[PDB]
Amino acid sequence: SKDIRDYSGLELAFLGDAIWELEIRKYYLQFGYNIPTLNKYVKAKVNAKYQSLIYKKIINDLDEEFKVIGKRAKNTFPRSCTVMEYKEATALEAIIGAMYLLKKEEEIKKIINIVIKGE
Amino acid sequence: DFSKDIRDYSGLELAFLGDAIWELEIRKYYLQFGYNIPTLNKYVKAKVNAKYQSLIYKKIINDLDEEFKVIGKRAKNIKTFPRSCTVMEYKEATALEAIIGAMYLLKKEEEIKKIINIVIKGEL
Ligand SMILES: [Mg+2]
Ligand SMILES: [Mg+2]
Numbered sequence: 001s002k003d004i005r006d007y008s009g010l011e012l013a014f015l016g017d018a019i020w021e022l023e024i025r026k027y028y029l030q031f032g033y034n035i036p037t038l039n040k041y042v043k044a045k046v047n048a049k050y051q052s053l054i055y056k057k058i059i060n061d062l063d064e065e066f067k068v069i070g071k072r073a074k075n076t077f078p079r080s081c082t083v084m085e086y087k088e089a090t091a092l093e094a095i096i097g098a099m100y101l102l103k104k105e106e107e108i109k110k111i112i113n114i115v116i117k118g119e
Numbered sequence: 120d121f122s123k124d125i126r127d128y129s130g131l132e133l134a135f136l137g138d139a140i141w142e143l144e145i146r147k148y149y150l151q152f153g154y155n156i157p158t159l160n161k162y163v164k165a166k167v168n169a170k171y172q173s174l175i176y177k178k179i180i181n182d183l184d185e186e187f188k189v190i191g192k193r194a195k196n197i198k199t200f201p202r203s204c205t206v207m208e209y210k211e212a213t214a215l216e217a218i219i220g221a222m223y224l225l226k227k228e229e230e231i232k233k234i235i236n237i238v239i240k241g242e243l
Binding site for chain 2: 001006007010011014015018019021022025026029030032035038
């Protein structure tokens with residue numbers, strides 16, 4: 001059940017996407033925003049275009065193992081973003097998914113905190 | 120820090136959080152078999168829809184602590200005719216995601232695992 005042992009890029013991203021959504025939802029679900037606004041704020045941080053900047057914002061610092069995960073992760077034209085952004089976005093979800101599995105659930109809080117200190 | 124589940128939390132807010140919590144757990148369990156995306160997604164959607172969560176709710180509701188039974192109930196009682204299910208099922212689907220959402224906020228993540236265990240136990 002090791003990291004890259006049985007988990008592929010997409011499989012890691014699949015898990016990371018769900019993790020990311022949960023965190024973004026937990027954070028905005030505390031300001032008493034109404035359903036319509038609550039969705040707008042979350043949707044602005046759950047999209048790939050934004051997910052990309054979060055990556056380019058931490059990739060150069062994350063642990064080696066995670067740097068490799070993201071790397072291969074950047075390998076059907078995207079609807080609302082650059083092919084380059086959709087890949088990094090996957091790289092981000094793939095990395096998150098990995099940290100979670102490795103119980104390294106602290107490098108995540110450090111990535112989430114960077115998302116909150118911006119909006 | 121947040122507030123109490125009743126301090127200022129609507130059943131719709133919990134169900135919102137609960138929904139994300141439910142997906143995560145479901146993808147986790149299925150992401151360990153080695154299925155391919157199409158297949159993986161197929162198994163996930165199967166236990167992530169309103170009809171299924173509804174079976175869950177109706178199978179646990181009577182055994183949940185008082186505090187949860189309340190949340191579940193107020194959450195049930197939409198002016199939005201559901202598509203794949205009925206009004207009652209959709210409501211119980213929200214009530215279920217409301218309870219799951221609540222347990223989490225109350226650090227009762229161990230109570231969530233017990234419900235998730237009845238999701239895959241009835242799957243094998
Ligand atoms: Mg995603
Ligand atoms: Mg749902």
